[PDB]
Amino acid sequence: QAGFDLLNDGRPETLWLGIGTLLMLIGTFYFIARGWGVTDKEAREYYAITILVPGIASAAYLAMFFGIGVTEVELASGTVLDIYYARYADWLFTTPLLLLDLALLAKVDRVTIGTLIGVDALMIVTGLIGALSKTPLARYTWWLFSTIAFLFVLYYLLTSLRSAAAKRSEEVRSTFNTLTALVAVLWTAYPILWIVGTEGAGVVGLGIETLAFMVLDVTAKVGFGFVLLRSRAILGETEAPE
Amino acid sequence: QAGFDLLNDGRPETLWLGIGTLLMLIGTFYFIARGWGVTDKEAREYYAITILVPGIASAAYLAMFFGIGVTEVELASGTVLDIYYARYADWLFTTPLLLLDLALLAKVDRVTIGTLIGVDALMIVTGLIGALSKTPLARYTWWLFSTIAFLFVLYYLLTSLRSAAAKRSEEVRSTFNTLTALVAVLWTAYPILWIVGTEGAGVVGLGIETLAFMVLDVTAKVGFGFVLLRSRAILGETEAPE
Amino acid sequence: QAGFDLLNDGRPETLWLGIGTLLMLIGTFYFIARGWGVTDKEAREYYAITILVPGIASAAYLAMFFGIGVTEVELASGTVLDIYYARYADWLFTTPLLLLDLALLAKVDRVTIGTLIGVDALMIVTGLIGALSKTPLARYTWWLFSTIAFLFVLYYLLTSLRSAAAKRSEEVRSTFNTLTALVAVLWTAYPILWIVGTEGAGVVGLGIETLAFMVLDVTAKVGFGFVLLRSRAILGETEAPE
Numbered sequence: 001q002a003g004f005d006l007l008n009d010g011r012p013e014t015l016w017l018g019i020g021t022l023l024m025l026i027g028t029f030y031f032i033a034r035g036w037g038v039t040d041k042e043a044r045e046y047y048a049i050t051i052l053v054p055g056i057a058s059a060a061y062l063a064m065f066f067g068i069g070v071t072e073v074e075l076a077s078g079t080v081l082d083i084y085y086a087r088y089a090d091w092l093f094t095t096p097l098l099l100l101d102l103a104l105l106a107k108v109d110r111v112t113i114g115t116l117i118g119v120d121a122l123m124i125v126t127g128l129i130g131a132l133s134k135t136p137l138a139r140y141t142w143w144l145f146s147t148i149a150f151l152f153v154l155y156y157l158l159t160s161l162r163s164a165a166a167k168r169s170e171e172v173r174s175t176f177n178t179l180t181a182l183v184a185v186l187w188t189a190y191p192i193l194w195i196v197g198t199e200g201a202g203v204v205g206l207g208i209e210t211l212a213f214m215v216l217d218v219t220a221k222v223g224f225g226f227v228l229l230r231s232r233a234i235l236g237e238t239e240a241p242e
Numbered sequence: 243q244a245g246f247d248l249l250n251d252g253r254p255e256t257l258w259l260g261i262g263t264l265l266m267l268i269g270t271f272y273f274i275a276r277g278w279g280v281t282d283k284e285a286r287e288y289y290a291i292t293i294l295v296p297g298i299a300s301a302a303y304l305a306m307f308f309g310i311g312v313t314e315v316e317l318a319s320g321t322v323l324d325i326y327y328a329r330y331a332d333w334l335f336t337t338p339l340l341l342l343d344l345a346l347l348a349k350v351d352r353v354t355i356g357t358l359i360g361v362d363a364l365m366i367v368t369g370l371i372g373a374l375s376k377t378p379l380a381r382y383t384w385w386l387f388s389t390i391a392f393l394f395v396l397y398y399l400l401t402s403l404r405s406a407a408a409k410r411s412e413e414v415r416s417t418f419n420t421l422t423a424l425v426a427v428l429w430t431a432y433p434i435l436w437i438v439g440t441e442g443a444g445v446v447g448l449g450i451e452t453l454a455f456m457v458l459d460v461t462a463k464v465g466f467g468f469v470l471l472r473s474r475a476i477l478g479e480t481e482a483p484e
Numbered sequence: 485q486a487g488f489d490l491l492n493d494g495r496p497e498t499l500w501l502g503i504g505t506l507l508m509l510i511g512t513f514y515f516i517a518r519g520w521g522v523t524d525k526e527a528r529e530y531y532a533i534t535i536l537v538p539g540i541a542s543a544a545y546l547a548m549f550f551g552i553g554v555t556e557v558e559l560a561s562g563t564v565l566d567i568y569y570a571r572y573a574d575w576l577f578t579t580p581l582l583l584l585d586l587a588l589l590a591k592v593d594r595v596t597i598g599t600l601i602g603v604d605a606l607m608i609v610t611g612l613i614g615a616l617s618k619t620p621l622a623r624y625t626w627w628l629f630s631t632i633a634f635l636f637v638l639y640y641l642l643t644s645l646r647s648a649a650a651k652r653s654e655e656v657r658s659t660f661n662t663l664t665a666l667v668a669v670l671w672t673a674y675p676i677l678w679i680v681g682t683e684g685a686g687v688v689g690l691g692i693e694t695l696a697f698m699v700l701d702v703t704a705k706v707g708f709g710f711v712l713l714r715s716r717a718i719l720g721e722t723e724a725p726e
């Protein structure tokens with residue numbers, strides 16, 4: 001179980017990376033060609049934010065595709081791992097923007113949003129330190145650490161944002177809850193795949209692992225986007241409470 | 243004079259790093275458990291900002307603790323130094339937020355704040371380049387360079403912010419001046435400890451040096467926090483001038 | 485054709501780097517000494533933004549000057565290249581601020597500006613990945629990629645910003661168009677010099693190349709600055725449309 005070695009360099013996962021790259025690209029331009037003539041100031045804002053997501057994911061995927069986005073991490077026993085660090089560079093900007101989109105739709109104050117980006121980014125960096133960790137003690141401490149943060153993100157997402165989004169139209173609250181649910185479950189798959197992936201225990205090959213992340217990423221990016229830029233809630237209405 | 247070699251890897255300073263890590267953690271949660279039910283929108287904002295500080299310091303300390311946050315820098319004479327670079331990753335986000343807190347309490351315009359973060363970050367990066375410098379000529383040029391910037395930060399802090407904070411309540415001006423004084427002296431210790439530390443001349447071992455930074459950092463983070471989140475000035479009142 | 489080997493380390497381009505460093509410094513302080521007593525809140529804002537540009541360029545130039553800002557990139561054939569990566573660290577903050585200045589003068593909404601920084605930064609990073617690429621296939625893919633983004637930047641600059649700047653005074657529109665033209669042509673020289681520089685085909689030595697970038701950078705930084713901080717358009721007037 002691996003895929004295809006598309007660059008004659010012993011990395012059959014490049015098949016999933018390539019497809020991943022291709023999919024983020026068409027999304028970036030689907031969204032761009034889709035909002036190109038949108039005059040609504042609220043929506044064009046959602047479009048801009050959402051277009052950059054697959055946009056930056058595309059660079060990370062292309063990077064990993066070529067091999068530039070991956071690095072060899074020697075463990076404490078001399079055992080080498082191929083860590084695709086670029087994912088974190090990706091996530092450092094993508095996840096915050098995704099949150100941003102949820103925060104705009106919910107009409108939350110700048111403090112909540114700031115808390116959101118800060119805790120989320122703390123999560124990504126610490127997740128990256130875990131990835132480059134040489135000792136298992138450290139690799140797992142960072143995991144729980146990054147996870148505590150994610151726990152905080154989900155919390156404020158499932159309370160502050162949700163209740164704030166309930167003060168708006170049913171059309172709006174509807175769309176918010178059907179991205180927050182998507183977020184909740186889709187995002188959660190990430191830490192699991194990591195601790196069971198090659199960065200953790202390792203009962204899942206890098207191939208399947210690279211396949212999972214592609215599916216998870218595309219769906220969290222493009223799938224989220226399609227749904228979001230397709231709703232009517234983004235068309236007008238500027239609330240304020242919570 | 244060193245401390246304790248807590249990880250059997252020849253780094254007795256890990257004793258100070260560990261304690262440093264532990265102290266930033268309890269602070270992060272002290273503040274979190276302390277503002278958890280704060281409805282005041284002004285204060286919850288100060289809380290959020292201030293909670294992230296020990297929060298990010300904790301990741302840097304844990305990083306250095308494990309050894310991941312330190313790197314060997316070969317000098318021009320083949321002489322190796324153990325540079326704890328992670329401190330700068332820390333400071334790149336912590337010092338700006340600390341400034342932010344002072345800027346909110348003072349009610350300064352967005353231009354002043356922008357100038358503040360920009361010059362301060364310039365200071366940290368240049369300080370980091372100095373740390374990784376191989377030649378002493380370069381290591382000291384960067385020091386003065388980073389110091390010129392810090393000089394600008396202290397300046398606008400002791401004039402623009404101070405006078406702007408004097409237009410507010412005595413309770414507010416009081417708290418502002420008792421953090422700005424703390425800032426002024428505590429922050430200043432940093433460049434001194436550096437030029438006299440292992441990154442500069444070196445009349446102070448990495449142990450004592452790592453001890454000093456821990457004391458300085460905890461007091462600048464948690465000490466600042468305690469004092470700030472404990473004042474009444476953060477509870478309400480939204481001015482505007484200067 | 486090279487210049488002068490100012491540090492006895494086989495890098496005659498340090499002559500252009502040094503001059504580049506020196507020129508960014510006097511600019512940083514020319515601007516600082518020039519706006520030191522400016523009370524106009526609009527202009528002081530332009531000044532602050534514009535002062536940081538040569539300011540950060542100075543750190544990058546000094547970095548490259550010492551050699552710290554350059555790294556050896558082994559190509560797929562074992563052929564080594566001296567990549568001055570620091571330029572991108574430079575550009576990651578400088579180009580966005582330059583755009584910022586154009587966006588303020590034009591009075592564009594926060595969405596346009598956000599789109600601007602995001603696409604521009606995507607351009608710089610991807611340009612940096614191209615620089616560190618080992619294969620030519622990859623080095624050129626990244627070039628087109630970074631170029632597509634730049635294409636988007638020029639687009640929204642020559643339409644959204646321009647038309648938005650035409651709603652203001654003739655004095656304002658005048659200055660906007662005489663920086664946007666400068667931007668348009670000066671910025672465009674960059675990708676060309678790259679693909680023809682040592683990072684691409686290579687029909688231009690690193691000396692001339694390092695000379696060109698210095699001329700291009702100084703003129704885009706200090707030249708832009710002089711012109712901008714010298715206009716009357718920055719003195720007052722706060723519009724709003726587009």
Ligand SMILES: CC(C)CCC[C@@H](C)CCC[C@@H](C)CCC[C@@H](C)CCOC[C@@H](CO[C@H]1O[C@H](CO)[C@@H](O)[C@H](O)[C@H]1O[C@H]1O[C@H](CO[C@@H]2O[C@H](CO)[C@H](O)[C@H](O)[C@H]2O)[C@@H](O)[C@H](O)[C@@H]1O)OCC[C@H](C)CCC[C@H](C)CCC[C@H](C)CCCC(C)C
Nearest residue numbers: 071085118122125135294301302305308309310311331335
């Ligand atoms: C788009 C723009 C903005 C910029 C683009 C973004 C990029 C900056 C993204 C970069 C991502 C990279 C991190 C990806 C990874 C790249 C790889 C290639 C480098 C991996 O190394 C990273 C590491 C550096 O140090 C080690 O690795 C280098 C390189 O391979 C080695 O040359 C070096 O020697 C290594 O380290 C030392 O440690 C090892 C291990 O130590 C022990 O060794 C003993 C045996 O001797 C035993 O094995 C023991 O178990 C080991 O622990 C030593 O062997 C060696 O001799 C050296 O001592 O650095 C990792 C990253 C670093 C920790 C950065 C911390 C980041 C901080 C926490 C970020 C804080 C940010 C907040 C979260 C922001 C929140 C803001 C809110 C809004 C408030």
Ligand SMILES: CC(C)CCC[C@@H](C)CCC[C@@H](C)CCC[C@@H](C)CCOC[C@@H](CO[C@H]1O[C@H](CO)[C@@H](O)[C@H](O)[C@H]1O[C@H]1O[C@H](CO[C@@H]2O[C@H](CO)[C@H](O)[C@H](O)[C@H]2O)[C@@H](O)[C@H](O)[C@@H]1O)OCC[C@H](C)CCC[C@H](C)CCC[C@H](C)CCCC(C)C
Nearest residue numbers: 313327360364367377536543544547550551552553573577
């Ligand atoms: C949380 C998210 C956002 C991301 C997380 C944050 C991270 C990005 C933080 C990363 C921090 C790291 C910098 C920490 C350090 C990590 C270590 C492990 C790497 C240290 O190396 C850094 C260096 C790279 O180059 C050298 O090191 C590598 C790695 O060990 C080597 O493989 C490489 O060969 C080295 O360099 C070359 O130079 C040496 C020395 O040159 C001369 O050599 C001769 C003898 O031959 C003689 O010794 C002479 O004296 C030497 O000078 C050569 O020997 C070698 O062959 C190579 O030529 O890079 C340092 C950092 C770089 C300068 C970045 C500049 C940053 C810029 C200035 C930032 C601008 C940002 C503004 C300040 C922002 C302001 C914004 C405002 C709001 C406006």
Ligand SMILES: CC(C)CCC[C@@H](C)CCC[C@@H](C)CCC[C@@H](C)CCOC[C@@H](CO[C@H]1O[C@H](CO)[C@@H](O)[C@H](O)[C@H]1O[C@H]1O[C@H](CO[C@@H]2O[C@H](CO)[C@H](O)[C@H](O)[C@H]2O)[C@@H](O)[C@H](O)[C@@H]1O)OCC[C@H](C)CCC[C@H](C)CCC[C@H](C)CCCC(C)C
Nearest residue numbers: 052059060063066067068069089093555569602606609619
């Ligand atoms: C001021 C504050 C904020 C912080 C300061 C800013 C700094 C973070 C700036 C840092 C800039 C640095 C990138 C500058 C460069 C520094 C140099 C010294 C490092 C260069 O390496 C970078 C590379 C790491 O990986 C490789 O290099 C290291 C170091 O020399 C090696 O030890 C490592 O082994 C290397 O990689 C592996 O790959 C090679 C090549 O692969 C194949 O190999 C085969 C033969 O085996 C054949 O040659 C094939 O052709 C090759 O392809 C292997 O040989 C090797 O064994 C390893 O497998 O990493 C590059 C950077 C990385 C891709 C980061 C991606 C950044 C992402 C895309 C950013 C997204 C950000 C968005 C654009 C933000 C938009 C925001 C909007 C607002 C929305």
Ligand SMILES: CC(/C=C/C=C(C)/C=C/C=C(C)/C=C/[C@H](CCC(C)(C)O)C(C)(C)O)=C\C=C\C=C(C)\C=C\C=C(C)\C=C\C=C(C)\C=C\[C@H](CCC(C)(C)O)C(C)(C)O
Nearest residue numbers: 006007035036044047048052055595596599625629632644
């Ligand atoms: C072009 C590109 C990539 C190209 C890649 C190539 C060619 C790869 C080739 C690979 C090969 C050949 C491989 C061969 C292998 C063998 C190799 C071998 C072994 C032989 O070596 C083999 C055979 C498969 O096995 C990327 C572009 C990438 C482009 C990107 C990422 C663009 C981003 C745009 C944004 C982000 C816009 C944003 C627009 C916005 C925000 C617009 C906003 C407007 C709103 C208006 C306002 C508010 C701003 O004023 C709106 C109206 C909504 O548009």
Ligand SMILES: CC(/C=C/C=C(C)/C=C/C=C(C)/C=C/[C@H](CCC(C)(C)O)C(C)(C)O)=C\C=C\C=C(C)\C=C\C=C(C)\C=C\C=C(C)\C=C\[C@H](CCC(C)(C)O)C(C)(C)O
Nearest residue numbers: 111112115141145148160248249277278286289290294297
């Ligand atoms: C950082 C972190 C959490 C951060 C949280 C943050 C930032 C939260 C922010 C919240 C905000 C902003 C809230 C805003 C709200 C406002 C509301 C709003 C406005 C937003 O709507 C409101 C109402 C105010 O709340 C956790 C780290 C968590 C870190 C953890 C859990 C670390 C664990 C380490 C271990 C377990 C080490 C173990 C070390 C060992 C075992 C060492 C052993 C050594 C020997 C090792 C050897 C040699 C055997 O290998 C030894 C024995 C010591 O020598």
Ligand SMILES: CC(/C=C/C=C(C)/C=C/C=C(C)/C=C/[C@H](CCC(C)(C)O)C(C)(C)O)=C\C=C\C=C(C)\C=C\C=C(C)\C=C\C=C(C)\C=C\[C@H](CCC(C)(C)O)C(C)(C)O
Nearest residue numbers: 353354357383387390402490491519520528531532536539
């Ligand atoms: C970057 C820097 C300073 C930056 C400052 C900034 C950004 C300030 C911003 C201010 C703002 C925004 C203000 C806003 C205000 C608005 C008010 C408000 C709104 C905010 O309320 C207002 C009113 C408008 O002002 C300094 C660098 C400073 C850099 C320095 C000092 C560098 C020194 C280098 C040396 C000394 C090299 C030496 C090189 C040598 C000796 C080389 C020798 C060679 C031989 C070497 C060998 C071989 C012997 O080893 C040689 C001889 C040349 O070959």
Ligand SMILES: *C/C=C(C)/C=C/C=C(C)/C=C/C1=C(C)CCCC1(C)C
Nearest residue numbers: 127143146147150187190191194220
């Ligand atoms: C487009 C990418 C998305 C939505 C990525 C989401 C990623 C996460 C929620 C990652 C969480 C992680 C932990 C909780 C622990 C350690 C490692 C991570 C970074 C995989």
Ligand SMILES: *C/C=C(C)/C=C/C=C(C)/C=C/C1=C(C)CCCC1(C)C
Nearest residue numbers: 369385388389392429432433436462
């Ligand atoms: C929580 C951390 C704080 C408050 C750190 C403050 C650090 C400084 C004011 C550091 C200043 C430095 C110079 C002026 C010169 C060179 C090196 C530095 C980075 C240590």
Ligand SMILES: *C/C=C(C)/C=C/C=C(C)/C=C/C1=C(C)CCCC1(C)C
Nearest residue numbers: 611627630631634671674675678704
């Ligand atoms: C002060 C520095 C300025 C104004 C730099 C501008 C740089 C560009 C417009 C660079 C563009 C590039 C491409 C379009 C392709 C690949 C590489 C770059 C980064 C050189």
